DNA sequence: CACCCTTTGAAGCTC
DNA sequence: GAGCTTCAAAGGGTG
């Protein structure tokens, strides 16, 4: 199937906190909410931060276990995308 | 109903 | 190895 890229730190931070943000705040609009995740990152102690790099790597390994050598490109260049040359 | 806007990181692609 | 480009999430807002 479209085996998604192995999500990084902030994508998990989103998955966890974003639900809470959306429950707490008036906002839903992902681009604003994601800048909220950006802000919320500043609350993470160095250890809480580190946890994400661990988690990210856990997911990375899960990806490798579920799909031995699944190379990222499940949809590379399918979305047009804005900014592009970030 | 796909892309915009946004965030970081990885990992695609390109050189 | 050094670098540039796209998807991942994601939801109203835009198109």
8 A C-beta contact, residue A53 and residue A6: no
Three-state DSSP at A66 gives helix
Q: Going by C-beta distance under 8 Å and a sequence separation of 6 or more, which residues neighbour residue A36?
A: A21, A25, A27
A10 contacts A37 by C-beta, under 8 angstroms = yes
Decide: A31 and A21 in contact? Cβ < 8 Å.
no
Question: What domain range includes position A61?
Answer: 1-86
* Strand C–CB A76 distance below 7 A: yes
Contacts of residue A4, defined as CB under 8 A and 6 or more positions apart, other chains included, come to A74
Distance A72 CA to C2 C1' (A): 20
> Method used for this model?
NMR
Does residue A85 sit in helix, strand or coil? coil
Which residue is closest, via its CA, to the C1' of B2? A79
Which nucleotides in chain B lie closer than 7 A to a protein CB?
2-13
CATH code of the domain covering residue A67: 1.10.30.10
Q: How far is the CA of A12 from the C1' of B6 (A)?
A: 16
Domain count, chain A: 1
Query: How far: A85 CA to C7 C1' (Å)?
Result: 14
């Amino acid at each position: 199937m479209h085996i998604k890229k192995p999500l990084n730190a902030f994508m998990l931070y989103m998955k966890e906190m974003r639900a809470n943000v959306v429950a707490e705040s008036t906002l839903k609009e992902s681009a604003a909410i994601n800048q909220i995740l950006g802000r919320r990152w500043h609350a993470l102690s160095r250890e809480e931060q580190a946890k994400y790099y661990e988690l990210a790597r856990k997911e990375r390994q899960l990806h490798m276990q579920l799909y031995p050598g699944w190379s990222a490109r499940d949809n590379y260049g399918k979305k047009k995308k804005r900014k592009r040359e970030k």
